Amino acid sequence: TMSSEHTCIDTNVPDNAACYRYLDGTEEWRCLLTFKEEGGKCVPASNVTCKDNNGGCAPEAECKMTDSNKIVCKCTKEGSEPLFEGVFCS
Numbered sequence: 111t112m113s114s115e116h117t118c119i120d121t122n123v124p125d126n127a128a129c130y131r132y133l134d135g136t137e138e139w140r141c142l143l144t145f146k147e148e149g150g151k152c153v154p155a156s157n158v159t160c161k162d163n164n165g166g167c168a169p170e171a172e173c174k175m176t177d178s179n180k181i182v183c184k185c186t187k188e189g190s191e192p193l194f195e196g197v198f199c200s
Contacts (some may be wrong), residue, residue, distance in 0.1 A: 124152045128194050140197040143183055166199045181195065 111117065121137030123129035125163035127147065129139040142153040143166030146175060158181065160173040165181020167173050170190060175180045184200025185192035192199035 122150065127152050128197065129157075130193060130198055138198065140168070140193070143195045143197065144179070164197075166195060166197060168192070168199055170199055171196045 111119065111131075116120050116133070118129045118137035118139065121129060121131070121139055123139045124141070124147065126145045127139055127141035128133055129137065131137045132188045138145070140169070141147050145152040146155045146158055146166065157180065160175045160181045162172065164183060164184040165171055165175075167183030168185050170187050171192065173184040174184070176182055183192075183196045185196040186197075190199040
């Protein structure tokens with residue numbers, strides 16, 4: 111992993127998404143805030159927002175909408191480290 115990226119080494123990581131490997135050597139692939147993976151494939155959300163389930167956030171991220179009705183995701187549960195989009199925060 112270069113030095114310690116903790117990112118998967120060869121798991122399923124579709125484009126427009128972010129993948130990260132856990133400390134147990136496991137592997138997880140997440141999608142951006144505008145992409146949702148459903149069935150192993152990820153597609154543009156647009157309709158996904160706070161009104162729905164995490165408009166592209168993470169299992170530990172808060173959902174907030176902007177003046178444009180865009181769902182923003184930010185992980186910060188004390189000692190939490192959101193990744194790029196926050197869909198997955200350490």
